[PDB]
Design a protein around this ligand. Structure first.
Ligand SMILES: Nc1nc2c(ncn2[C@@H]2O[C@H](COP(=O)(O)OP(=O)(O)O)[C@@H](O)[C@H]2O)c(=O)[nH]1
Ligand SMILES: [Mg+2]
Length: 167
């Protein structure tokens, strides 16, 4: 009765994929991470009375040159695509990634969401909320902004992709 879910987190370097993940899992904000080594975490959470057993695959740095596989894996139940609101490059990259991801998964019913991280750095924002939102809307995907410094926003992200997967 405990549900199991594998979630992959994708995106450009230094957008905070690791920090968001560690914050969701361990409740702390970390200022450094091995950016080219893929990490997988496990995490239990109860959502609306249901117990979930999470595996979170925190992917290594990706950019527009990264090889995406041509076939999807049955055991991955959702994809979180992260860019940083402080980096134009990361926003452009996440669009290239979504494109390659779609080529990989085709029409399979595996949810994809879009996250603009680092909303706490408001003096360095270069991506508007509307841009992320409308990009997500054009993908028919969920959209959130987040800050890895703010536990609740990290929780909201992962909770959303779980809710989407069951939709
Ligand atoms: N202020 C702020 N800094 C962040 C946030 N997320 C990540 N960082 C910092 O950005 C740097 C890269 O983050 P990291 O998670 O390692 O990026 P990754 O390559 O996508 O895994 C680290 O120094 C983090 O401490 C955030 O939401 N707010
Ligand atoms: Mg990472």
């Amino acid at each position: 009765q405990s549900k199991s879910r594998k979630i992959a987190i994708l995106g450009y370097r230094s957008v905070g994929k690791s920090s968001l993940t560690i914050q969701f899992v361990e409740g702390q904000f970390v200022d450094s991470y091995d950016p080219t080594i893929e990490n997988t975490f496990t995490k239990l959470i109860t959502v609306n009375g249901q117990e979930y057993h999470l595996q979170l695959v925190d992917t290594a740095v990706q950019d527009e040159y990264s090889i995406f596989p041509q076939t999807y894996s049955i055991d991955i139940n959702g994809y979180i695509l992260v860019y940083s609101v402080t980096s134009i490059k990361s926003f452009e990259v996440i669009k290239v990634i979504h494109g390659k991801l779609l080529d990989m998964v085709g029409k399979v019913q595996i949810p994809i969401m879009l996250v603009g991280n680092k909303k706490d750095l408001h003096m360095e924002r270069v991506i508007s909320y509307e841009e992320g939102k409308a990009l997500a809307e054009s993908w028919n995907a969920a959209f959130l902004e987040s800050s890895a410094k703010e536990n609740q926003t990290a929780v909201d992200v992962f909770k959303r992709i779980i809710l989407e997967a069951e939709k």
